[PDB]
Ligand binder design. Sequence first.
Ligand code: HEM
Ligand code: DSO
Ligand code: K
Length: 404
Amino acid sequence: LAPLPPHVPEHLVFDFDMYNPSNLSAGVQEAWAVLQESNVPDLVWTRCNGGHWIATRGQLIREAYEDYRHFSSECPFIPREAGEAYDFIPTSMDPPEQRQFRALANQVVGMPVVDKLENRIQELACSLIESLRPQGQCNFTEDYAEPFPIRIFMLLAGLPEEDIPHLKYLTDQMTRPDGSMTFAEAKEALYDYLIPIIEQRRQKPGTDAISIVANGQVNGRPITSDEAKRMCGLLLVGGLDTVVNFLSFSMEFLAKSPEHRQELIERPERIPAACEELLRRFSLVADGRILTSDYEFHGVQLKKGDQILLPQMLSGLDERENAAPMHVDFSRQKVSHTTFGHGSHLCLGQHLARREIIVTLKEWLTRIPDFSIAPGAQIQHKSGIVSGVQALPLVWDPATTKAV
Ligand code: HEM
Ligand SMILES: CN(C)c1cccc2c(S(=O)(=O)NCCCCCCCCNC(=O)[C@]34C[C@H]5C[C@H](C[C@H](C5)C3)C4)cccc12
Ligand SMILES: [K+]
């Protein structure tokens, strides 16, 4: 527990540990939702992980994400040392500079690119599911979720299929740290892969995402090799753990809820609505910002350089945003959330992510409608900047399935 800074009043101290919340065993969203109990202020200070603020309610989370002038993305991660080393584009950049980098990234992941990839995502989902179907079991996280978004990225980026295991190794090294290397070290190992490919595609560009990014124009001039590297790093990583972990939460819920499965089986037109409601209930990201100056925010004195965690996960779980927030209802009229963030850095991959989710659910429920958690398995969650599922053993009777 880091020493309490003099400017932080005692009554605001709640020692929440974002990497190991108490009662994690009861579900990660539930563990974070303790920050929304009635005796907890809207803005608290935890002495864990170096000490930082946490905004606990959707209203403050949204407001801080809007106010980039006070709440900077220069140091967006807890602990401070990771936030400082992090230089991905556009996620470590503030407006106004961020705007045009964001525009360039949008060219390679935006809605028209997604409408085009639709059928290719479907063919990949089908091949994975058909490979598992007659086995009557899988670890969903390992056997479907982990192979799926990396394969979509390779297609986007014109990278060879044979590079997948190495690239998976490099990205896992960075986002699932075991303590053997600093974030900085992992980032450099990732950059070492990207550097030659960027060099090759600035000399001989194709029409893949890396070529488009590495030869783009930003803020008047050509993008540097350095900036292209920093953007490619994000385009690769941004869609991996988020999608893997989110698909896992969703499938865990569906395995545990026969009635919700049956709803989507009987009413497949509800899957897009179901996707949105699961994005709210099983929201999973929590990054934040650093104070650019002393600032009073909702009656609380914040100090220049303080970090503030602004958990995207919490907005939609807030009972002030959605009534009975832990209840899943696919017919919810106004599904409010900030699962993809808010403000100037709102997820550029959100359209791609939704197709990945919807295609997965549609294809899985068509082929393997009836499945359960393996009996005696207790699903373990993990908490951090991207919270997730450690493993997801599923079982089914292959006689209830259909090759489609
Ligand atoms: C369920 C899946 C996903 C979730 C929950 C998610 C969540 C988020 C969040 C919360 C942010 C904002 C972070 C901040 O403000 O600091 C973000 C930004 C971003 N995401 Fe996603 N994301 C997902 C999938 C993807 C995918 C598939 C891609 C494709 C590569 C992607 C690419 C990006 C990029 C490029 C940004 C930066 C936008 C900017 O800085 O202007 N995301 N995402
Ligand atoms: C004791 N001290 C001080 C410590 C020292 C060292 C490590 C510590 C750890 S730690 O070992 O768990 N390290 C935490 C750092 C992990 C960050 C990696 C994510 C980057 C990739 N993702 C994105 O860019 C994105 C950016 C954006 C938001 C989000 C989703 C998408 C989009 C991708 C993330 C925990 C606790 C304490 C530690
Ligand atoms: K930084």
